[PDB]
Amino acid sequence: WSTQVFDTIQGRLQAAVDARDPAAIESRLKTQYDQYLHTTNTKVAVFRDVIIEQDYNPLAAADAAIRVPTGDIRDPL
Amino acid sequence: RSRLPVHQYMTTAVRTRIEPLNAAFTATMEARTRRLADATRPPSWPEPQSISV
């Protein structure tokens, strides 16, 4: 189970989290948080599930996330 | 890079609270230290070989 599932998934998590440069992460989170700050300061209120997804689209942050594929499992067999 | 894996990093509070987790953290530190030695060792120079005709 370790080698087939957990070792594979952790190896694919690495070389992706490792590949992501810390400066790029800081800049990405900064653009996101400054967009949220700007919409908070300009607009009277901020609502979830109500956004215009034009001036501020928070879900882009979730889009810019590491995705890892799947292989096979021995325990479930 | 080579950051310690998330599921395996025991904070000092957790290590103090749970001794087996502290032992596991020490074991993982020992393993990571050991991993460097094999790489540093020059794996070349195979054994002398006797052929015959």
């Binding site: 189970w1 599932v5 957990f6 998934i9 499992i73 325990d75 479930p76 067999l77 | 599921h7 025991m10 957790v14 749970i18 001794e19 087996p20 987790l21 596991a24």
Partner: protein
């Protein structure tokens, strides 16, 4: 004169057991002070099955309460029927298990298990003849599941031949209470497969669905679900306590229900569960009770029987009825739904009749079905356990309580093997 040792484990198990003892005392006419006030000879005829006679006329339940935190059994003692139990039967720790099966089975259950087994042995040795033990608890919790599995293993070692009955509240499919429920359930199922001889699977969400669709309740607290479970727990053993036209003890039910020993998980149901509104509009007939009994909504288990195949099914009726009526009704059900019943078993019905119905109901019927449908429940628990276990989230606590990480692989493998048994005996062909 065939005694049963009741054990309650965890908060959910303790609450359900308290409700069950309240129901049993109501059936036997025992007031919360222990004196008999039932005005019926049959009630005192077999009162020794659940109770022992005290120094006076008081009757003390043969119940043992376990916990790692004192608050739950403090509430139980403050409850309406908290004073019947013997104080020596209340075994508690001081720090509750943080929904950690490892804490409830290895670290904090280890010290209390000695006292638990001491009280269990004291209660068992007093019994002239022992049918077995019944443990009421909830899968998906720390102290409940952990101490339940540990005590079940200990009692299995001590009394291999005695019956072991379990009422496990499996974590619900859709809405889950705690995060580590799949972990706890996966660890508990491995022990329950090996040790417990006979097991009932219950779901909070299945109970909610039945209480809104049949009972049509508005604000069902946990007490109502506990009441339904208590009704099932009484009806499963009413044959031991009351004379029956065709009686059947726990071992008879197990023999007629369990085709292969590892396939001992059963879904239960109680009939007639009728809404307050339709009490007059419904008519109490054996065909009515059978129709409600075989409905998918009547199962207290989330898995619907329709997807799987019924390996076996027992029906314990209570009340003055015609055995011809019961047998014809259940044979008709089998013929009508033969596709849903296993072919290589000519009769999938174990019908038993008791002559004493529960109070208020002219007649009742409890259903215990071993069907391959629970395969999907175990599959869902695996789909959650694998999702967490692939990243080892929440795993470091269990690793730190002194259980090896290989034990999780063991438990998941065993549960998946059980899933394989259910599927292959679902798709097995005769000849």
């Amino acid at each position: 004169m065939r005694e049963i040792v009741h054990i309650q484990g965890g908060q959910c198990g303790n609450q359900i057991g308290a409700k069950f003892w309240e129901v049993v005392s109501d059936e036997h006419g025992i007031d919360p002070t222990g004196t008999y006030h039932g005005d019926s000879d049959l009630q005192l005829e077999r009162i020794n099955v659940y109770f022992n006679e005290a120094t006076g006329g008081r009757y003390v339940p043969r119940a043992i309460l376990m916990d790692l935190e004192p608050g739950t059994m403090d509430s139980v003692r403050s409850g309406p029927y908290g004073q019947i139990f013997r104080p020596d039967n209340f075994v508690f720790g001081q720090t509750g298990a943080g929904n950690n099966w490892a804490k409830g089975h290895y670290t904090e259950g280890a010290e209390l298990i000695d006292s638990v087994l001491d009280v269990v042995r004291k209660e068992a040795e007093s019994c002239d003849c022992l049918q077995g033990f019944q443990v009421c608890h909830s899968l998906g919790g720390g102290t409940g599941s952990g101490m339940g599995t540990l005590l079940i293993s200990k009692i299995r070692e001590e009394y291999p031949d005695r019956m072991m009955l379990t009422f496990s509240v499996v974590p619900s499919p859709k809405v889950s209470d705690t995060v580590v429920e799949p972990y706890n359930a996966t660890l508990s199922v491995h022990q329950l497969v090996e040790n417990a001889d006979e097991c009932m699977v219950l779901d909070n969400e299945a109970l909610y669905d039945i209480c809104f669709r049949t009972l049509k309740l508005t604000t069902p607290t946990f007490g109502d679900l506990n009441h339904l479970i208590s009704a099932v727990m009484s009806g499963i053993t009413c044959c031991l306590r009351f004379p029956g036209q065709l009686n059947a003890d726990l071992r008879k039910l197990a023999v007629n229900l369990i085709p292969f020993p590892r396939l001992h998980f059963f879904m239960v149901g109680f009939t007639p569960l009728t809404s307050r509104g339709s009490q007059q509009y419904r008519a109490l007939t054996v065909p009515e009770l059978t129709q409600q009994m075989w409905d998918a909504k009547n199962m207290m288990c989330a898995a619907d029987p329709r997807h799987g195949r019924y390996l076996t099914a027992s029906a314990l009726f209570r009340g003055r009825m015609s055995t011809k009526e019961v047998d014809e009704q259940m044979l008709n059900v089998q013929n009508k739904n033969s596709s849903y019943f296993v072919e290589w078993i000519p009769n999938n019905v174990k019908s038993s009749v008791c002559d004493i119905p529960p109070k208020g109901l002219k007649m009742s019927a409890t259903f215990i079905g071993n069907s391959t449908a629970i395969q999907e429940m175990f599959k869902r628990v695996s789909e959650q356990f694998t999702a967490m276990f692939r990243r080892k989230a929440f795993l470091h606590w269990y690793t730190g309580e002194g259980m090896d990480e290989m034990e999780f692989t063991e438990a998941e493998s065993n549960m998946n093997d059980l899933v394989s048994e259910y599927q292959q005996y679902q798709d097995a062909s005769a000849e």
